[PDB]
Amino acid sequence: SGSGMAQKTWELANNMQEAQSIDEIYKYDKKQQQEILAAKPWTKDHHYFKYCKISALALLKMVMHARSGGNLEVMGLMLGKVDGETMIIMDSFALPVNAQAAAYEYMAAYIENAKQVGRLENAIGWYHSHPGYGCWLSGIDVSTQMLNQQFQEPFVAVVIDPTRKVNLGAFRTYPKGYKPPDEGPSEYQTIPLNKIEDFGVHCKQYYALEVSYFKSSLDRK
Ligand SMILES: N#Cc1ccc([C@H]2[C@@H](O)CCCc3cncn32)c(-c2ccccc2Cl)c1
Numbered sequence: 128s129g130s131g132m133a134q135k136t137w138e139l140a141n142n143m144q145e146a147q148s149i150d151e152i153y154k155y156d157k158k159q160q161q162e163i164l165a166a167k168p169w170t171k172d173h174h175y176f177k178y179c180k181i182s183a184l185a186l187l188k189m190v191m192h193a194r195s196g197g198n199l200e201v202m203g204l205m206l207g208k209v210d211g212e213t214m215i216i217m218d219s220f221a222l223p224v225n226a227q228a229a230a231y232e233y234m235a236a237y238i239e240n241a242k243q244v245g246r247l248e249n250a251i252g253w254y255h256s257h258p259g260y261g262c263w264l265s266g267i268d269v270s271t272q273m274l275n276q277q278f279q280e281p282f283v284a285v286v287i288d289p290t291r292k293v294n295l296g297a298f299r300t301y302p303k304g305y306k307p308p309d310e311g312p313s314e315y316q317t318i319p320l321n322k323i324e325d326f327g328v329h330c331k332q333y334y335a336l337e338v339s340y341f342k343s344s345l346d347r348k
């Protein structure tokens with residue numbers, strides 16, 4: 128008696144509670160992100176961030192863009208958020224002249240599209256390719272990333288080599304005049320002779336983040 132109607136109501140309750148849960152999670156993430164963004168811990172610690180988690184969707188799009196330029200460098204922007212000492216990259220878009228209003232209005236539509244599925248994301252960094260010479264920051268890249276870690280903070284610099292296996296680097300510049308201790312050669316990389324000077328000189332003005340990769344529930348399609 129009312130067994131059929133009970134099943135429908137139970138399904139409806141299950142669906143209504145999922146939506147409410149999604150909204151609650153988004154709102155908790157938003158306030159938790161507004162907390163750290165107003166706190167700015169990265170301004171005091173210079174080795175604050177240590178990890179970079181990249182979604183398979185963001186990697187797919189970045190590698191596709193990188194390949195499309197062939198021998199020529201390519202760049203774009205990354206969407207994500209902060210989680211303690213970890214920079215999370217969830218999505219990315221290619222770049223791209225009156226003004227870069229397009230790069231600003233694209234960014235807003237990605238955040239909005241993600242909001243609909245209950246995903247909290249914002250501009251977290253920039254990516255670019257080094258076709259054939261490896262993952263590191265050139266002198267021009269270090270000057271760019273130092274300025275980014277002033278005006279665009281929190282901001283990460285991803286470098287992809289689409290020619291040679293999983294050749295991706297995630298980096299953070301140190302501030303002008305900051306002398307850090309210890310040694311950081313980590314993984315060995317074969318870079319050309321005509322780039323080794325630019326490499327070795329600036330190779331201490333920044334550091335590498337520990338890159339990890341993840342597939343989200345939404346990043347399965
Ligand atoms: N913001 C910033 C910015 C800074 C530098 C570059 C270029 C520049 O140095 C030229 C040599 C190759 C290079 C290797 N790494 C960086 N670059 C770029 C750049 C500009 C157009 C297309 C692709 C990129 Cl990657 C952007």
Ligand SMILES: [Zn+2]
Pocket residue numbers: 255256257263264265268286
């Ligand atoms: Zn570069």
